[PDB]
Design a protein around this ligand. Structure first.
Ligand SMILES: Cc1ncc(COP(=O)(O)O)c(CNC2=C(C(=O)O)C[C@H](C(=O)O)C2)c1O
Ligand SMILES: Cc1ncc(COP(=O)(O)O)c(CNC2=C(C(=O)O)C[C@H](C(=O)O)C2)c1O
Ligand code: FES
Lengths: 462, 461
């Protein structure tokens, strides 16, 4: 009801039924990315069931977006309630016609986990439009700094309509190499993960700073890592200055607490505190992307909480585990006029309904601390495996269950993933020679041990 | 299923709505909020607010409610145990689709696919639909230019840092008065109102005139033909000019009926000629049916009115279709995975609802109904236009997709307010025009009800 006791394999993955369904789907669209087809009705807890009857320990959790496992009894109970039916079949335009329980349900969910210093909340449907509207909020804010208390000039008003200055300023958002912030054309400009994401798509001439590449083991590279982070910070400042000279002023800086798709790249809390200070120094809005790191896998609900700041950022975006997307922000960044930050749905109240219960479960079952613990067990296991197989494993790193390690090359990475999948464990890859772990929040230490045993055998027979 | 009339108790917004708006205004700008709603009590064409008011809804959540509120078929859908999973286990559709994914697609979207378009990709809203359509078009164009060869090393290296040749300086041609979304790609092709555009970085992309027809149409045939010809010629000119600026037009995006720009119409001939121009210059033809799609014009997709066997290369949709996404020709199919991709790519629950919505639209013959009720509404509006020329002008529309102009700002706002207090919910476009976006269960007696109420309103104005 809550979970299975272990993985159970029947066929290779993908199996014949999955291959048939993939053959079908491939007619109407490129289906090359598809791993296999799933039986979500029979999936439970940490275990994903496919259409061929295979039951796998899922450590990818739908690209880190399933918060408390599959078919959780609490959510099942939520959908079974008559009074909730409407919420699923009457989707409102939240900007103009919100439901009666909108504010209260927000108090039961998002507002109860608001980041320090951020009294404002705007909901969105995914991380991409979250980051887009964060960008826009920031541009509006910067221009507001520049012109306030003056009003919209007629020239601005008329030129903005035809995509020209001064109506459309030539401002920039600073981003980092290895970043990932979305696929829409605004987000994509700040994304620098893989070429296949970027190529043949028009972009923005915005500044791109290096993200620190830490050396491992960390306790043998203290000075080097310090110097690396310092270098990156100075290059950030220099980029801000350079682009101010270009009359392409940096209005904001966007960054992930942990770069995921770029290859699970970590940096010290000190680094982020200093980056925050730099952002404040040049009057740039500090935007933290917690779309992937948010939801408690790092041991705290938001990853940036590790930095220990009362003033951690100006804007923080979220999605995935949070069911709905959106962003928190300081009151300073509140738009002064309606219909500037706006779209049709602005999320979905049903997702809020699920999220309230998700958060209640996270709090009641103490899942943050559990993430810290289970993640520690997992990391210990990974370090053991690294010691025993230096020909296959290196740079074991992580925080909470947000863990990863590097393999020799991409082919070995994919072989390992494939074999693990056939052995009952679902894995995902970042960078693309790095194996990553994104388990759901009901992932316990014994799941860590299950995985570690299976993968141990795999490595022994590789 | 449906009430048989509006029922007002207070002014709108009433006290409870004002309190809730006060509460919401703490955490965000709530100035846009009309009032708070009781969706549990709403049924069919009638919206119920938190002050007990019941209004005839001719706005339908900005034209996104297909078959009315609390439809019994959808209720039944949510009541089934076997559907529970679908609502609580949201998959990363690009990599791990549910077993019934393809079949549910056959039951829904694939059953109303436009002519010539065998490909389909799902998205969660209109903005990412249009963005990914843009990207699909860019990819297709670069594919034409490099033709069945690998990405060069230079392109692979330059695209990572936002530079040519990896990042081409391609353009999408859009029209003045258009609206295609708020994200920074869509926003560049959007030209409806300045408050949408101001202070946001954009793209130097070609912007063409959209025809402004004169009414009555029967009294301005030649004039309108001249206007349309002018617009087409300016489009071709823009394509050439931007080709010469090394900012090649990879595609043209257009709405069958402009909406946020003030419900701007054009002849079917104009759109056929625009299609031809598109094919002529190697530009992909992208039709935005986010708002026109669903069947309010009397056919499922509005472009169907044009009568073309080859109406477009790509067509985007959302709103009424519960989920968003786009259809396209096989030749626009991405050559490799992970180029058009995101986490969710829509939502299987939306597909679940949509299959039933489409089933109802079919079985209840709601396209024809939209045509008929639309005709009744338009006739009525023409009558009121005749009787109150000092208030109503340029009465126009297709199916229930109708609209008209008022003398100015204030009159439009006042009329909407009075109509709302009288139990009729209306929306405004261009901030001068009143538009109608009724659900598909809007019938001719609802039209009469409205025409009637609004008639007395004009009489007392
Ligand atoms: C930090 C961060 N910021 C923004 C996004 C975009 O979210 P969405 O996919 O638009 O909902 C994401 C989504 N993450 C994705 C992938 C990953 O981390 O592996 C892969 C997916 C993709 O588009 O390829 C999306 C993200 O992780
Ligand atoms: C033709 C067309 N094309 C794209 C979109 C984008 O849709 P979405 O709001 O991002 O789901 C829309 C959404 N419509 C909107 C409004 C309207 O019709 O008046 C108002 C909303 C807004 O952003 O202001 C979006 C549209 O109508
Ligand atoms: S852009 Fe966020 S849902 Fe379409």
């Amino acid at each position: 009801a809550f979970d299975y006791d272990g993985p159970l394999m029947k066929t290779e993955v993908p199996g014949p039924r999955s291959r048939e369904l993939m053959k079908q789907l491939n007619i109407i669209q490129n289906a090359e990315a598809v791993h296999f087809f799933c039986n979500y009705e029979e999936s439970r807890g940490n275990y994903l069931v496919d259409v061929d009857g295979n039951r796998m320990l899922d450590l990818y959790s739908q690209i880190s977006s399933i918060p408390i496992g599959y078919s959780h009894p609490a959510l099942v109970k939520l959908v079974q309630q008559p009074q909730n039916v409407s919420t699923f079949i009457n989707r409102p335009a939240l900007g103009i016609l919100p439901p009666e329980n909108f504010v209260e349900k927000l108090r039961e969910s998002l507002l109860s986990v608001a980041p320090k210093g951020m009294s404002q909340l705007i909901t969105m449907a995914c991380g991409s439009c979250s980051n887009e509207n964060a960008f826009k909020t920031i541009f509006m804010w910067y221009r507001s700094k520049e012109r306030g208390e003056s009003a919209f000039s007629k020239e601005e008003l008329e030129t903005c309509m035809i995509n020209q200055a001064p109506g459309c300023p030539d401002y920039s958002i600073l981003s980092f190499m290895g970043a990932f912030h979305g696929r829409t054309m605004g987000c994509l400009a700040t994304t620098h993960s893989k070429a296949i994401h970027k190529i043949d798509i028009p972009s923005f001439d915005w500044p791109i700073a290096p993200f620190p590449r830490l050396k491992y083991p960390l306790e043998e590279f203290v000075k080097e890592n310090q110097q690396e982070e310092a270098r990156c910070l100075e290059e950030v400042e220099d980029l801000i200055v350079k682009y101010r000279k270009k009359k392409k002023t940096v209005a904001g800086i966007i960054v992930e607490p942990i770069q995921s798709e770029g290859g699970d790249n970590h940096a010290s809390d000190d680094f982020f505190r200093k980056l925050r200070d730099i952002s404040r120094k040049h009057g740039c809005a500090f935007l933290v992307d917690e779309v992937q790191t948010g939801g408690g896998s790092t041991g705290k609900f938001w990853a940036h909480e590790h930095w220990g700041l009362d003033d951690p950022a100006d804007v923080m975006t979220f999605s995935k585990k949070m069911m709905t997307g959106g962003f928190f922000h300081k009151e300073e960044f509140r738009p002064n006029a309606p219909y500037r930050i706006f779209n049709t749905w602005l999320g979905d109240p049903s997702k809020n309904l699920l999220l309230a219960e998700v958060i209640n479960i996270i709090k009641r079952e103490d899942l943050l601390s559990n993430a810290a613990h289970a993640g520690k067990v997992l990391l210990t296991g990974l370090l053991d495996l690294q010691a025993r197989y230096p020909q296959f494993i290196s740079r074991v790193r992580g925080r909470g269950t947000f863990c990863s390690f590097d393999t020799p090359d991409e082919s070995i990475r994919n072989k390992l993933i494939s074999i693990a999948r056939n052995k009952g464990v679902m894995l995902g890859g970042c960078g693309d020679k790095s194996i990553r772990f994104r388990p759901t929040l009901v992932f316990r230490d014994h799941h860590a041990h299950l995985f570690l045993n299976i993968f141990s055998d795999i490595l022994a027979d590789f």
